[PDB]
Amino acid sequence: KLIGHEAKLLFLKSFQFILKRQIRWLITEMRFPKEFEHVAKIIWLKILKTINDQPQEELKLQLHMTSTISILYLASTHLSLPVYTCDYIKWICTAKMPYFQASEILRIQLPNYYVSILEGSISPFNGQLYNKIALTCGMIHFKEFFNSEISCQGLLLKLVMQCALPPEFYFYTKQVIEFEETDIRNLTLWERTDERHTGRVSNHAELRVLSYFMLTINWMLSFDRDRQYPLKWILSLTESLTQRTTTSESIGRNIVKVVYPDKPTSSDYFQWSEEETLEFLKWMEKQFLPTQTDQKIARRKLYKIFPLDSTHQLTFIEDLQERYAKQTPFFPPARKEAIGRLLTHIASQLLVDFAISKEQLKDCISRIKNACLHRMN
Amino acid sequence: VQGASLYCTLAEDALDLHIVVKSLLCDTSQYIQTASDLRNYRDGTEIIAYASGKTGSVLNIAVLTRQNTLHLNRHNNVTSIELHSPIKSIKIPGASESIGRRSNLVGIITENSFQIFRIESVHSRSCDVMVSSSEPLYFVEIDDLQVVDFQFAIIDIKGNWSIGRIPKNFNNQLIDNLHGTIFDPEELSSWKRIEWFSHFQKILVFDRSKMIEIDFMNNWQTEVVQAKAWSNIRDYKRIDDKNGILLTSREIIIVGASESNDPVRRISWKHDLDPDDTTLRITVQKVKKPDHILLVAFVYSMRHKRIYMHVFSHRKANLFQSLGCSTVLEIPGGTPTGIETIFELVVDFLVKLRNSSEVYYYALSNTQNSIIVDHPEWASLFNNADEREKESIGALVSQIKLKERERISRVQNLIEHENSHDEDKYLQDLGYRLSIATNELLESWQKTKDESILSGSLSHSKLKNLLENSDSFASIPEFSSLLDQFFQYYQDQDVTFIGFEKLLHLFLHEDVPGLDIFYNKLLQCWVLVSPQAELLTKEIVKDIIWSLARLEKPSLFEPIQNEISRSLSGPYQDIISSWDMDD
Amino acid sequence: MFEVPITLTNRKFAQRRKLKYQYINYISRRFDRISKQQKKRRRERHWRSVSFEIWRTVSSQNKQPINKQKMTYHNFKKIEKIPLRKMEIPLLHCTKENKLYFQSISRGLEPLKTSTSEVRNYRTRHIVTLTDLLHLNVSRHNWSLAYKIFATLIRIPGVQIKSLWGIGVEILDNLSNSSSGLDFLQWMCQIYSSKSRSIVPPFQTGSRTHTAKFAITYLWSSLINCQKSMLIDKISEWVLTPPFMEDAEVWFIYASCHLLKADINQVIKHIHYVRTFLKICLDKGGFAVPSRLIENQLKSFES
């Protein structure tokens, strides 16, 4: 029935087909530029040419889904588009961008060795995405062939708006950024291996950006000898950040919280509310039609026994505005507490949003914090 | 149902749940058989006196230290200063039993260890608790002992048990003469358990495979009706009233207890609870009321700080019913190592969490008629130590703060000039100055045009090396018009095109048609919050529009060259596989 | 932190079950010596038990007369020493984590992490949340929402659920729309009474010998849907219909239908009828009133 030992050709066809399918969804439904597609044929072309410059009938390829997302991010980053990894994580964990299947339920029957090579390694959630984009960035070289500078400043904007920080922190963190780097940010972390143990927890540019962001908030707020930032407004900031409200975004972050590996975030689904659960089942019947894999008509009548069957919640900048106002009353050692709880909530959001670990993040911001103390002392 | 229509559909009752009241009390993968903390009230003197609620708490470096001290109760339940003792063994359960009220309110307290089995007495007066060490036995056996039960010191060591007695006060030590075993080669897990039943002088012995009753002053042994086909015995504790038995299986809360003077099983139906977790444990609290006698079942774990609660009721026709389930949570990382209990419900207990020397009193209420962060992983990241690493941070903070002042005073006058003829001159010589540099870079893109190895022309997307020309203007709409007429100007083909609006879509999460409305929305948000929000919001929309400001490689006709040419060097039928427009 | 209504993600849990029951076999084998293949796993897991209306248990009498210690340190490590190396052979074939699990359960330590807690799929996690919201809403009397949950759920291809008592009491308290608790139950019996393990305790079962909970509860609860009356010959018409002879509880249902129909020689025949089915209900594991009470109602009838 199914191919033997040269279903490399069919494998790469379901893979490439799934890629162009995803591109279709992001130019169409995400209003990308048509140039992206060509950038994708070039990158997928380079690594296709590199795996078909490889001999063995033993396949040795890993075209996991992380490779799909890896070349999408790679191409997007060459094109300097202000999309970041967390956009992809959100997009795929909310079933909008089709992902979590081989040729989703509807196709082809392949050797179960390759269906496993697809379904396996599916998760991006421990930094698998950063690691696979750096791995691809070795597989074909970032430096001469492409421009692997991240879209830094839009990430800063994304970040300040993602909190409710006043726009001064964009320039604050932008400045600490310039202070340690002078704004040079790469994509490879590659020396093909598994092995690594120092220097290289922190050289995926983004993770360092978040690290500078956190640091900035901590330093800045704990050394406003001016007293520009009230002992209270740090609390009011924490509370406007904490109040679970139903916008497209936060609903999304809940949807990602559901498939994040570690507690607490699943205790976070515990502390959600009937409308969150409802819109959840909604997204379940919508985007888990993207499922995977006589009595049949007996179940068409069996299910047909029970019926299958002024806009309320607000937009993103609406919520953003209203918490910006919820703090609009702007104009002693236990304020360190307020600094800490704010930093830890911000951290939480970053951990679920950028699919990394608690320990990963704090490793990075620890390392790069000592990397600022060292070039400051 | 059963009785209502044996006589000849919602509930009994409406829907009520769980609330907290918290307090501090005192401060100090394969797991094993342990559980080590108690508090119970007795009075020694019994010269017509009362009981004293005492704690046997545990102090750890190696867990060498056993500590006994009094508790004075109140609505605010505290302690009074501490009393202490050590042992060279690693210490496991402190247990202080109490036979129910057929008789008396009981004496003193016992512990199981790494080698040893010890039992202490106590006298007390005037806020001191002086105990005495009723003598250890390191072993006869070279065998660790699972559980102690209680005047009768009963030990269980993995698959064999012994009934024993304790000396009287002083200084002869503890002996036994009745013994047995429940050994089962094919149960690998080490925990067994002895707790007896009805006070009849008959015991219960347990392993994760089965439950054996042993009438031990005759000769009697029984394996009670299930065994080990689908679930493990998970825990068992005698729900305090003598003739009462509470057993956690996997996915079942079992209320055993006699409804005959002789020992029992109850298959009076039960509730079920849903994991594969080996680490589950249980404890009951027992509240009294006129029409019923109800029992709250706390099943807790070593994996998640959540507590899983069910409730039963004893209307003494030996009537038992069940209402509905409820579960509460608990805080950061870690999990309960000890949960111990003592028209609304109040139920109160203490918890100790995995690897946290704290002991927290909790109380739970029915209705409502009436983070202090030390995350050592982040504080170590925020407080950094030395004084020069304090004034270091402050130094950097000042550097940037005065820098920001430079930004404000700098841009201010640039804001003064809007729609001026000066800013017009600047937008002209700016726009087409940049156009000249762009053409130059396009010529040096013609010289290297035949690379055909890549399709990313070097260091492209820029203002292209004139940097002061960016900043100086300060009018978003005339700048958007500059860019629209620059894109218009370089419409001479083989040049990049990229539509911003469709990308600001990603920024504000709604359709952002104009480069201006972007500035409006940000400006509303920040005008609520900052002075010179117009200056910053303008400086940041300028910074964004620059960070994105496209000028990538020569356009769509240039990439297809390298597209096909890399689609050449590849061997022939990967080239046959390379496929556009699937379906 | 609650049970999941999905078949558990597989490989490592199954090969761990292998190591476990295989070592179990070697230890218990040598233990009976000292007291003197999917199918190997199958026999192995096999030979092992697999004032109000209390369905009482079997209490303590007619049982053994104790044992005295079998297992000292030296004697146990005697039994343990050899089967652990036999285990050293296929441990070399399993995975390092699996090997560690074998080492720890065989020391007697119990693993920190649940099967769920280490599980690792989009569609199934979504179904988990769906089903969860079903059970939650049904608990919350939110029969409208709960109904939406149920319809959207049954739509899905993914998993069959024993979860059936969940839907029995679910549609029961729902009353909302869908072909109801009785329809579901009689469906359960019609599909699963013919040839046409892990998951299964008694509250969901197969129709070789007693399917219990749902059947007896629709039985009694339907007789209470006659408590609505004062339907019966219907309920005992389809309690008459099925052969699943190990019940007797439907014999007491039957005789209860005759006592309810007995509330002239016709009423006589109904009273002789209940008199018969109470003894052909002494056929099996007894449901007993003092039953001279049953007869005393029958003499209040004999008036």
Backbone angles phi, psi at B460, to 5 degrees: -80, -75
Q: Which of A146, A222, A249 sits opposite B456 (nearest CB)?
A: A146
Nearest to B268 by CA among B223, B313, B231, B206: B313
DSSP letters, A178-203, are HHHTSS--------SSS---SS-SS-
- Say how many CB pairs under 8 Å bridge A and B: 239
Q: Which chain B residues are within 8 Å of C224, Cβ to Cβ?
A: 1, 4-5, 9
d(CA B70, CA B39): 9
Which residues are paired to B41 by β-bridges?
B53
C133/A95 Cβ within 8 A: no
**Biggest distance spanned by C-alpha atoms of chain C:** 81
Q: Which of A123, A284, A303 sits opposite C130 (nearest CB)?
A: A284
A105/C157 Cβ within 8 A: yes
Nearest to A98 by CA among A27, A13, A25, A5: A25
d(CA B409, CA B413): 8
In sequence order, what are the residues at sequence separation of 6 or more whose Cβ sits closer than 8 angstroms to the Cβ of residue B531? Answer: none
d(CA A352, CA A86): 9
Residue with tokens 């009094």: B70
C2 inside 8 A of chain A by CB: no
d(CA B60, CA A297): 66
B2 inside 8 A of chain C by CB: yes
Handedness of CA A175, A179, A180, A182 (dihedral sign): positive
B223/C64 Cβ within 8 A: yes
Write down which chains contact chain A via at least 3 CB pairs under 8 A: B, C
Residue with tokens 């959001």: A349
d(CA B464, CA A201): 33
Nearest to A123 by CA among A260, A326, A243: A260
Environment class of residue A187 by beta-carbon count within 10 Å: exposed (0-12), middle (13-18) or buried (19+)?
buried
d(CA B215, CA A282): 59
Give the pairing of strands B175-180 and B192-196: unpaired
Two tokens, residue B151? 């005047």
In sequence order, what are the residues at sequence separation of 6 or more whose Cβ sits closer than 8 angstroms to the Cβ of residue B15? Answer: B324, C141
Which residue does chain A place closest to C142, by CA atoms?
A274
* Shortest Cα–Cα distance, C72 to chain B (Å): 7
A106 inside 8 A of chain C by CB: no
Which residues are paired to B294 by β-bridges?
B287, B313
Type of residue numbered B215: D
Per this entry, what is the length of chain A?
377
Give the pairing of strands B21-27 and B358-364: antiparallel
Write down which chains contact chain C via at least 3 CB pairs under 8 A: A, B
Are the CB atoms for C31 and C24 separated by under 8 Å?
A: no
C289/B6 Cβ within 8 A: yes
C136/A280 Cβ within 8 A: no
Residue A251: in which H helix or E strand, if any? helix A248-257
* Shortest Cα–Cα distance, B373 to chain A (Å): 6
Handedness of CA B425, B431, B437, B439 (dihedral sign): negative
B213/C63 Cβ within 8 A: yes
Q: How far is CA B457 from the centre of its chain?
A: 51
Backbone angles phi, psi at B394, to 5 degrees: -60, -35
Backbone angles phi, psi at B148, to 5 degrees: -105, 140
Two tokens, residue A349? 């959001």
Two tokens, residue B468? 């002061």
Backbone angles phi, psi at B52, to 5 degrees: -125, 125
Residue C249 to residues C164, C212, C224, C226, Cα–Cα distance (Å): 20, 10, 15, 18
DSSP letters, chain C, are ----SSPPP-THHHHHHHHHHHHHHHHHHHHHHHH--HHHHHHHHHSS-----------S-S----------HHHHHHHHHTHHHHHHHHHTTS-HHHHHHHHHHHHT-B-SS-TGGG---HHHHHHHHHHHHHHHHHHTT-HHHHHHHHHHHHH--S-----HHHHHHHHHHH-SSSS-HHHHHHHHHHHSSS----S--SSS--BTB---HHHHHHHHHHHHHHHTT--HHHHHHHTTS----S-SHHHHHHHHHHHHHT--HHHHHHHHHHHHHHHSSTTSS-----SHHHHHHHHHHH-
Residues 38-97 of B with CB under 8 A from A: none
d(CA C97, CA C116): 16
Give the pairing of strands B65-72 and B78-79: antiparallel
Mutant choice from A118, A119, A254, A281 vs C, greatest count of C C-beta within 10 A: A281
**Domains of chain C, residue spans:** 10-50+72-120, 121-303
* Shortest Cα–Cα distance, C29 to chain B (Å): 8
* Shortest Cα–Cα distance, B552 to chain A (Å): 7
Backbone angles phi, psi at A123, to 5 degrees: -75, 140
C259/B8 Cβ within 8 A: yes
Residue A130 to residues A88, A201, A360, B319, C64, Cα–Cα distance (Å): 12, 11, 12, 61, 65
A317/B508 Cβ within 8 A: yes
Two tokens, residue B455? 């399709």
Are the CB atoms for B377 and A362 separated by under 8 Å?
A: yes
Are the CB atoms for B474 and B417 separated by under 8 Å?
A: yes
Alpha-carbon radius of gyration of chain C? 26
Mutant choice from B330, B354, B371, B373 vs A, greatest count of A C-beta within 10 A: B373
Nearest to A129 by CA among A58, A67, A209: A67
Are the CB atoms for A186 and A148 separated by under 8 Å?
A: yes
Q: Which chain C residues are within 8 Å of A305, Cβ to Cβ?
A: 178-179, 183
Q: Hey, what long-range contacts does B422-430 have (CB within 8 A, 24 or more apart)?
A: B423/B473, B423/B474, B423/B475, B423/B478, B424/B478, B426/B472, B426/B473, B427/B473, B427/B478, B427/B479, B427/B482, B430/B469, B430/B472, B430/B473, B430/B482
Method for this entry: cryo-EM
Two tokens, residue C88? 């050293």
* Shortest Cα–Cα distance, C151 to chain B (Å): 22
* Shortest Cα–Cα distance, A298 to chain B (Å): 31
Report angle CA A323, A328, A333 to the nearest 5 degrees: 95
Instruction: Write out the E strands in B197-268.
Output: 203-207, 210-214, 222-223, 235-237, 245-248, 253-256
Q: Which ranges of B21-136 would DSSP assign to H, the alpha helix?
A: none
d(CA B38, CA B25): 13
d(CA A312, CA B422): 48
Are the CB atoms for B413 and B420 separated by under 8 Å?
A: no
C76/B159 Cβ within 8 A: yes
**Biggest distance spanned by C-alpha atoms of chain A:** 79
C148 inside 8 A of chain A by CB: yes
DSSP letters, A262-298, are SSSHHHHHHT--HHHHHHHHHHHHHHTSS----HHHH
Are the CB atoms for B91 and B58 separated by under 8 Å?
A: yes
Handedness of CA B241, B247, B248, B251 (dihedral sign): negative
Residue B113: in which H helix or E strand, if any? strand B110-113
Which residues are paired to B53 by β-bridges?
B41
Burial code (b: 16+ CB inside 10 Å, e: under 16) for B269-282 equals bbbbbebbbbbbbb
For chain C, first and last CA: distance in Å? 60
From the CB of residue A298, how many other CB atoms can be counted at a distance below 10 Å? 12
Which residue does chain B place closest to A86, by CA atoms?
B506
Which residues are paired to B130 by β-bridges?
B123
Q: Which chain B residues are within 8 Å of C57, Cβ to Cβ?
A: 225, 264-268
B536 inside 8 A of chain A by CB: yes
A294 inside 8 A of chain C by CB: no
d(CA B190, CA B146): 8
Are the CB atoms for B23 and B77 separated by under 8 Å?
A: yes
Residue B196 to residues A292, A326, B37, B57, C147, Cα–Cα distance (Å): 53, 61, 20, 25, 48
d(CA A189, CA A138): 8
Q: Which of B404, B499, B533 sits opposite A33 (nearest CB)?
A: B499
Virtual torsion, Cα C145, C149, C150, C155, nearest 10 deg: 140
**Helices A358-374 & A168-180 angle (0-180, nearest 10):** 70
Two tokens, residue B272? 């079920």
Residue A297 to residues A145, A294, A301, C162, Cα–Cα distance (Å): 56, 6, 6, 21
* Shortest Cα–Cα distance, A195 to chain B (Å): 25
Instruction: Write out the E strands in B365-498.
Output: none
In sequence order, what are the residues at sequence separation of 6 or more whose Cβ sits closer than 8 angstroms to the Cβ of residue B245? Answer: B197, B204, B236, B238, B239, B254, B255, B256, B257, B264, B266
